[PDB]
Design an enzyme around this catalytic site. Structure first.
Site, short mmCIF file in Angstrom:
data_model
loop_
_atom_site.label_atom_id
_atom_site.label_comp_id
_atom_site.label_asym_id
_atom_site.label_seq_id
_atom_site.Cartn_x
_atom_site.Cartn_y
_atom_site.Cartn_z
N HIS C 228 -72.02 21.41 -10.49
CA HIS C 228 -72.09 19.92 -10.03
C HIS C 228 -73.05 19.18 -11.27
N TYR C 232 -74.14 15.51 -14.09
CA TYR C 232 -75.34 14.79 -14.28
C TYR C 232 -75.98 14.99 -15.88
N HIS C 379 -60.95 9.43 -9.22
CA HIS C 379 -62.56 9.29 -9.20
C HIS C 379 -63.22 9.78 -10.79
N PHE C 380 -63.13 10.80 -11.06
CA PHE C 380 -63.87 11.21 -12.18
C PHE C 380 -63.50 10.80 -13.79
N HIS C 381 -62.18 10.45 -13.80
CA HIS C 381 -61.77 9.46 -14.86
C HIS C 381 -62.49 8.19 -14.89
N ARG C 444 -53.41 17.80 -7.48
CA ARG C 444 -53.83 17.81 -8.99
C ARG C 444 -53.23 19.03 -9.42
N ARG C 445 -53.42 18.93 -10.82
CA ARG C 445 -53.26 20.06 -11.61
C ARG C 445 -51.79 20.57 -11.69
C1 HAS Z 1 -69.26 12.18 -15.31
C2 HAS Z 1 -69.36 12.35 -14.37
C3 HAS Z 1 -69.34 12.33 -12.98
C4 HAS Z 1 -70.23 11.57 -12.22
C5 HAS Z 1 -71.25 10.79 -12.78
C6 HAS Z 1 -69.89 11.96 -10.62
C7 HAS Z 1 -70.57 11.24 -9.52
C8 HAS Z 1 -70.62 11.63 -8.11
N1 HAS Z 1 -69.39 12.32 -7.76
FE1 HAS Z 1 -67.80 13.25 -8.90
N2 HAS Z 1 -67.31 14.41 -7.18
C9 HAS Z 1 -68.06 14.53 -6.07
C10 HAS Z 1 -69.01 13.56 -5.67
C11 HAS Z 1 -69.82 12.70 -6.52
C12 HAS Z 1 -70.82 11.92 -6.04
C13 HAS Z 1 -71.66 11.94 -4.57
C14 HAS Z 1 -71.39 11.20 -7.45
C15 HAS Z 1 -72.70 10.42 -7.36
O1 HAS Z 1 -73.28 11.03 -8.15
C16 HAS Z 1 -71.93 8.87 -7.46
C17 HAS Z 1 -73.22 7.87 -7.32
C18 HAS Z 1 -72.97 6.65 -7.87
C19 HAS Z 1 -73.01 5.38 -7.59
C20 HAS Z 1 -73.28 4.86 -6.25
C21 HAS Z 1 -72.51 4.11 -8.30
C22 HAS Z 1 -73.37 3.25 -8.63
C23 HAS Z 1 -73.08 2.08 -9.56
C24 HAS Z 1 -73.56 1.66 -10.92
C25 HAS Z 1 -74.79 2.30 -11.57
C26 HAS Z 1 -72.72 0.38 -11.52
C27 HAS Z 1 -73.48 -0.94 -11.34
C28 HAS Z 1 -72.85 -1.75 -12.25
C29 HAS Z 1 -73.56 -2.56 -13.25
C30 HAS Z 1 -75.12 -2.34 -13.20
C31 HAS Z 1 -72.90 -3.69 -14.33
C32 HAS Z 1 -73.22 -4.91 -13.70
C33 HAS Z 1 -72.73 -5.88 -14.92
C34 HAS Z 1 -72.08 -6.79 -15.20
C35 HAS Z 1 -71.73 -7.46 -16.37
C36 HAS Z 1 -71.44 -7.55 -13.85
C37 HAS Z 1 -67.43 15.38 -4.98
C38 HAS Z 1 -67.78 15.68 -3.69
O2 HAS Z 1 -68.94 15.61 -3.06
C39 HAS Z 1 -66.47 16.20 -5.79
C40 HAS Z 1 -65.43 17.31 -5.46
C41 HAS Z 1 -64.56 16.61 -4.20
C42 HAS Z 1 -63.30 17.52 -4.37
O3 HAS Z 1 -62.64 17.53 -3.41
O4 HAS Z 1 -63.28 18.44 -5.38
C43 HAS Z 1 -66.51 15.49 -7.09
C44 HAS Z 1 -65.59 15.86 -7.90
C45 HAS Z 1 -65.59 15.57 -9.75
C46 HAS Z 1 -65.03 16.27 -10.72
C47 HAS Z 1 -64.16 17.21 -10.51
C48 HAS Z 1 -64.60 18.88 -10.48
C49 HAS Z 1 -63.56 19.81 -10.57
O5 HAS Z 1 -62.86 19.40 -11.76
O6 HAS Z 1 -63.04 20.33 -9.61
C50 HAS Z 1 -65.59 15.71 -11.81
C51 HAS Z 1 -65.12 15.75 -13.49
C52 HAS Z 1 -66.49 14.73 -11.39
C53 HAS Z 1 -67.33 13.97 -12.35
C54 HAS Z 1 -68.30 13.00 -12.07
N3 HAS Z 1 -68.68 12.62 -10.62
N4 HAS Z 1 -66.69 14.64 -10.00
C1 HEM Z 2 -57.36 9.55 -23.39
C2 HEM Z 2 -56.92 9.24 -22.23
C3 HEM Z 2 -56.90 10.16 -21.14
C4 HEM Z 2 -55.72 10.08 -20.24
C5 HEM Z 2 -54.35 9.21 -20.44
C6 HEM Z 2 -56.13 11.11 -19.34
C7 HEM Z 2 -55.01 11.47 -18.11
C8 HEM Z 2 -55.56 12.49 -17.16
C9 HEM Z 2 -54.64 12.95 -16.22
C10 HEM Z 2 -53.43 11.92 -15.83
C11 HEM Z 2 -55.23 13.97 -15.61
C12 HEM Z 2 -54.67 14.55 -14.39
C13 HEM Z 2 -53.71 15.76 -14.65
C14 HEM Z 2 -53.67 17.00 -13.57
O1 HEM Z 2 -54.73 17.06 -12.74
O2 HEM Z 2 -52.71 17.83 -13.70
C15 HEM Z 2 -56.26 14.46 -16.26
C16 HEM Z 2 -57.26 15.51 -16.23
C17 HEM Z 2 -58.42 15.71 -16.91
N1 HEM Z 2 -59.17 14.60 -17.54
FE1 HEM Z 2 -58.37 13.30 -18.56
N2 HEM Z 2 -57.04 11.44 -19.56
C18 HEM Z 2 -57.83 10.80 -20.70
C19 HEM Z 2 -59.04 10.75 -21.19
C20 HEM Z 2 -60.09 12.08 -20.71
C21 HEM Z 2 -61.35 11.90 -20.99
C22 HEM Z 2 -61.80 11.13 -22.27
C23 HEM Z 2 -61.99 12.90 -20.34
C24 HEM Z 2 -63.32 13.45 -20.58
C25 HEM Z 2 -64.20 13.17 -21.42
C26 HEM Z 2 -61.04 13.55 -19.27
C27 HEM Z 2 -61.32 14.56 -18.42
C28 HEM Z 2 -60.35 15.11 -17.80
C29 HEM Z 2 -60.69 16.40 -16.90
C30 HEM Z 2 -61.97 17.22 -17.29
C31 HEM Z 2 -59.25 16.61 -16.01
C32 HEM Z 2 -58.99 17.62 -15.29
C33 HEM Z 2 -58.86 19.23 -15.80
C34 HEM Z 2 -58.58 19.95 -14.82
O3 HEM Z 2 -57.93 19.77 -13.55
O4 HEM Z 2 -58.48 21.19 -15.17
N3 HEM Z 2 -59.69 12.81 -19.50
N4 HEM Z 2 -56.71 13.36 -17.46
CU LIG Z 3 -70.17 17.51 -7.91
#
Ligand code: HAS
Ligand code: HEM
Ligand SMILES: [Cu+]
Ligand SMILES: CCCCCCCCCO[C@@H]1O[C@H](CO)[C@@H](O)[C@H](O)[C@H]1O
Ligand SMILES: CCCCCCCCCO[C@@H]1O[C@H](CO)[C@@H](O)[C@H](O)[C@H]1O
Ligand SMILES: CCCCCCCCCO[C@@H]1O[C@H](CO)[C@@H](O)[C@H](O)[C@H]1O
Ligand SMILES: CCCCCCCCCO[C@@H]1O[C@H](CO)[C@@H](O)[C@H](O)[C@H]1O
Ligand code: CUA
Lengths: 166, 33, 557
Positions: C228, C232, C379-381, C444-445
């Site tokens: 996790h 961050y 979500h994570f995209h 997925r996957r």
């Molecule tokens: C870089 C990456 C990632 C961040 C950051 C991230 C944030 C969260 N995630 Fe997630 N996630 C999960 C829950 C959260 C929660 C609670 C947060 C929190 O950290 C999110 C808090 C965020 C907010 C409350 C958003 C605040 C909004 C902001 C800051 C934008 C404001 C906009 C502005 C200021 C612009 C205004 C400007 C104008 C010009 C209008 C959970 C479950 O509890 C799973 C597992 C579920 C499952 O079945 O596997 C999960 C699964 C993933 C996986 C898959 C792992 C795998 O491959 O199996 C990845 C890669 C990932 C990435 C990331 N995730 N997440």
């Molecule tokens: C360039 C444009 C991209 C496209 C069109 C794309 C598309 C996708 C799609 C459709 C999947 C799901 C496939 C599956 O779960 O079997 C996937 C998985 C994933 N993508 Fe990307 N993606 C892009 C860029 C990125 C980037 C920039 C990152 C991170 C820096 C990223 C991180 C991941 C990860 C960590 C997974 C899943 C790996 C896994 O399940 O083992 N992707 N992508």
């Molecule tokens: Cu997590």
């Protein structure tokens, strides 16, 4: 105005964090609600039930498809389900509608998923360990089991069937 | 000036998205229960 | 000597340029499988076409691993090792140990290299999580381990610079970027214990022959201890850039030092003890310990809800300052013609639904609806591949000038914008198709294109996934012809290239000082960080480490 700006803004910071904690806890509340209902049945059991994946389709209750469904109460069935490289034993799983179904699932090789279309059955199957969930199907039909944990090249093809009898 | 109201309409959209997602997924969870 | 003697007055630029180029290179290679994976979730099979173009590739799933490892482990860490060192050193006008620093870049280059080879040669097709009992070449884990160990050196380097600035400056409170980087690097050490044990205690001996099997529950429990907060570890480089660099690109000020600081202290307490949100649907982990991790994950969202308000207010203030019109006047006053600004702002917008998806994910029982479906990559995209990546991309436009003295032309600035907008618009369209496809139960996957008749309810969100493969194909290609066009050009006009990182003035205030003073009580909170990890992972790991039930490795590809 650029320091009056500050004095305000840092009070909002306070009100947004207060509101946020509130909404967050209401969520904690409504999760809480779910763990008390029947729906909590899909949560895997605590206890470490150790098995030996190399022996599992030879001896024990996962060795014989005929013996998978085993009546365990007047309205209760234990189903021994085997998730393996590239389907499900038995197939189909036939279970009566209305009844508490207790899925006991394990694997002889690599990790699988056992997810049942239209239900919250959604569990990881690990070699060497028994995944124990419970469910009651409120209406009859076929339910497809999708394997949603990558396990090799037959992955996209790993499906099963549950027939829940009228 | 006074009120950082642009930022409030931001955190407002954020709150709503958060509620549509959580309430939508809550309803699905029950419907499959 | 050295004639871009650039790299002997400020040699830190030489090493940061290295990381960066290497980081973005892994990201070009990783992303190449992206659109291929997108058209697949759109139910078109472009793989025979790929395997033409790239004959080395044997399956959809080899793709998936390269994509994963290359994009999410290698691109992000190397981007963190850049930012989280170079910024601290520059705000403190000081030399990072170019001995220890040059070491880390080489630990990573060896690391990446050793790993890439079995991956390229189909020996390690286990995906970026490499879940036992799936078994990979010794080369993969040995690589992975040493690559991940590059950060530990990085840890010391920043801590080094921290310790030296204090002695030379006693009584003085820790300056902002530095404080950030300090807790960041501290978090990542505490968090990285999980993956490090799992390799040393299990993955290394196993893949060498030293033992026969691994217990899959422990393996996955150490993995997600790290797994996790590693998200961050990807998020906070961007956040560091966004708090303290972007309001300046916007023409504004950071509205608050404390808030920025309070955010980062929070990521230090709550980033690590939350790992069971990844394991809600595992057997053998107590339901009670899922609820606590549930609660704790929901608390980790809080520093990020804060962030939303502080940043929104910083962009608003700047907006107003540029004649920023009415209720929404301020949005159109911002510099919409600077890719440095556009990128992280568009990523912040996508981060609204993404964080919302996390909150569902976090909520224990709701995860049973969506776990292991297409929703999760949905979500994570939005999180890693839009926010983090967009922040890396749009930062080619300040950092690269500042490191090489290549100016950005005006034809390039415009290329920057066509990427950034195409990248964003393609990320959003893919988000919808995969959130929806996953609410329809599509795993997925999965090479789902091989079972074209299998998810027919998913037809229209499948139209959204095809539509995004093409849009993100164009974006990626326009990014290559431009990353290289910003680099391989033969101009260097480096007044621009010493020229301090546009750090941001901060609207100061009264209620500062005694609060900034508490958060700077560092050794105290670092230890609280360890006490919290210890209570969270303690009773469960104690249980499982006396029921070790190792099983044979398989290769199923
Ligand atoms: C870089 C990456 C990632 C961040 C950051 C991230 C944030 C969260 N995630 Fe997630 N996630 C999960 C829950 C959260 C929660 C609670 C947060 C929190 O950290 C999110 C808090 C965020 C907010 C409350 C958003 C605040 C909004 C902001 C800051 C934008 C404001 C906009 C502005 C200021 C612009 C205004 C400007 C104008 C010009 C209008 C959970 C479950 O509890 C799973 C597992 C579920 C499952 O079945 O596997 C999960 C699964 C993933 C996986 C898959 C792992 C795998 O491959 O199996 C990845 C890669 C990932 C990435 C990331 N995730 N997440
Ligand atoms: C360039 C444009 C991209 C496209 C069109 C794309 C598309 C996708 C799609 C459709 C999947 C799901 C496939 C599956 O779960 O079997 C996937 C998985 C994933 N993508 Fe990307 N993606 C892009 C860029 C990125 C980037 C920039 C990152 C991170 C820096 C990223 C991180 C991941 C990860 C960590 C997974 C899943 C790996 C896994 O399940 O083992 N992707 N992508
Ligand atoms: Cu997590
Ligand atoms: C960004 C999100 C866009 C959302 C698109 C609409 C979501 C509706 C999901 O439909 C679901 O279909 C399943 C049948 O297959 C049922 O189990 C379930 O009752 C039902 O809710
Ligand atoms: C007393 C024992 C402690 C071990 C000593 C740690 C130094 C490890 C060697 O690193 C080297 O440091 C040089 C000086 O900065 C660099 O020029 C060189 O390229 C780098 O690789
Ligand atoms: C609004 C969502 C619709 C998607 C398409 C948006 C692309 C338009 C953004 O172009 C921007 O237009 C500005 C003029 O206003 C210029 O200042 C700036 O140089 C240019 O980059
Ligand atoms: C012809 C223009 C007049 C109609 C105005 C509606 C514009 C819709 C833009 O909202 C978009 O909706 C997506 C979900 O669909 C979000 O994911 C995304 O962040 C957001 O950009
Ligand atoms: Cu079994 Cu995928």
């Amino acid at each position: 105005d650029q320091h009056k700006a500050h004095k305000a803004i840092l009070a909002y910071e306070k009100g947004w964090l207060a509101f946020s904690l509130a909404m967050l806890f209401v969520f904690i509340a409504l999760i809480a609600y779910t763990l008390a209902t029947h729906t909590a049945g899909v949560i895997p059991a605590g206890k470490l039930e150790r098995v030996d994946p190399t022996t599992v389709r030879q001896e024990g209750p996962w060795a014989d498809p005929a013996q998978a469904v085993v009546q365990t109460g007047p309205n209760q069935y234990t189903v021994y389900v085997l998730a393996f490289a590239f389907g499900y034993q038995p197939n189909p799983i036939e279970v009566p509608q209305g009844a508490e179904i207790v899925f006991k699932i394990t694997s002889p090789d690599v990790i699988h998923g056992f997810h049942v279309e239209g239900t919250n059955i959604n569990v990881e199957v690990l070699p060497g360990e028994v995944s124990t969930v419970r469910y009651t199907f409120k209406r009859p039909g076929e339910y497809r089991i999708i394997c949603n944990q990558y396990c090799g090249l037959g992955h996209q093809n790993m499906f099963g069937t549950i027939v829940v009898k009228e | 000036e006074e009120k950082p109201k642009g930022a409030l309409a931001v955190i407002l959209v954020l709150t709503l998205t958060i509620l549509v997602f959580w309430l939508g997924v809550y309803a699905v969870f029950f419907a499959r229960g | 000597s050295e004639i871009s003697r650039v790299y002997e007055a400020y040699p830190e630029k030489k090493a940061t340029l290295y990381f960066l180029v290497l980081g973005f290179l892994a990201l070009i290679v990783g992303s190449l499988f992206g659109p291929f994976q997108a058209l697949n979730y759109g139910n078109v099979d472009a793989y025979p076409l790929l395997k033409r173009l790239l004959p080395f590739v044997q399956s959809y799933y080899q793709g998936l691993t390269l994509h994963g490892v290359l994009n999410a482990i290698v691109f992000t860490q190397l981007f963190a090792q850049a930012i989280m060192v170079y910024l601290p050193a520059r705000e403190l006008n000081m030399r990072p140990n170019m001995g220890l620093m040059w070491l880390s870049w080489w630990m990573a280059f060896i690391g990446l290299v050793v790993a890439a080879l079995p991956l390229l040669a189909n020996e390690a097709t286990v995906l970026y999580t490499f879940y036992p009992p799936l078994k990979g070449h010794w080369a993969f884990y040995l690589g992975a381990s040493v690559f991940v160990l590059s950060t530990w050196v990085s840890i010391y380097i920043v801590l080094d610079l921290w310790r030296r600035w204090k002695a030379a400056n006693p009584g003085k409170v820790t300056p902002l970027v530095t404080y950030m980087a300090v807790v960041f690097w501290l978090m990542w050490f505490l968090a990285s214990l999980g993956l490090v044990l799992e390799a040393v205690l299990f993955l290394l001996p196993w893949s060498f022959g030293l033992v026969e099997g691994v217990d899959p529950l422990v393996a996955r429990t150490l993995f997600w201890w790290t797994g996790h907060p590693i998200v961050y570890f990807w998020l906070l480089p961007a956040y560091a850039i966004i708090y303290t660099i972007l309001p300046k690109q916007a023409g504004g000020r950071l509205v608050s030092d404390p808030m920025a600081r309070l955010a980062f202290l929070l990521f230090l307490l709550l980033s690590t003890p939350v790992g069971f949100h990844h394991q809600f649907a595992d057997p053998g982990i107590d339901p009670t310990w899922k609820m606590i991790h549930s609660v704790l994950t929901l608390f980790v969202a809080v520093p990020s809800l804060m962030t939303a308000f502080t940043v929104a207010a910083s962009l608003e203030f700047a907006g107003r300052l540029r004649g920023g019109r009415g209720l929404f006047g301020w949005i159109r006053a911002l510099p919409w013609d600077n890719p440095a600004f556009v990128a992280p702002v568009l990523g912040l917008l996508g981060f609204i639904p993404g964080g919302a998806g996390g909150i569902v994910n976090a909520s224990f029982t709701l995860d049973y609806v969506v776990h292991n479906t297409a929703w999760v990559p949905g979500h994570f995209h939005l999180q890693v591949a839009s926010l983090v990546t967009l922040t890396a991309m749009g930062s080619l436009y300040w950092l690269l000038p500042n490191l090489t003295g290549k100016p950005i032309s005006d034809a390039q600035r415009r290329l920057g914008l066509a990427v950034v907008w195409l990248w964003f618009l393609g990320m959003m369209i893919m988000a919808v198709g995969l959130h929806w496809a996953g609410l329809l139960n599509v795993p997925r996957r999965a090479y789902i294109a091989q079972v074209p008749d299998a998810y027919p309810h998913a037809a229209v969100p499948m139209v959204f996934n095809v539509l995004a493969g093409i849009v993100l194909l164009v974006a990626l290609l326009l990014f290559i012809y431009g990353l290289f066009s910003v680099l391989l050009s033969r101009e260097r006009k480096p007044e621009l290239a010493e020229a301090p990182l546009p750090f941001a003035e901060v609207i100061s205030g009264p209620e500062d000082r005694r609060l900034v003073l508490a958060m700077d009580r560092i050794g105290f909170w670092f230890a609280v960080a360890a006490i919290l990890v210890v209570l969270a992972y303690g009773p469960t790991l104690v249980q499982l480490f006396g029921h070790l039930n190792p099983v044979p490795g398989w290769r199923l590809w």
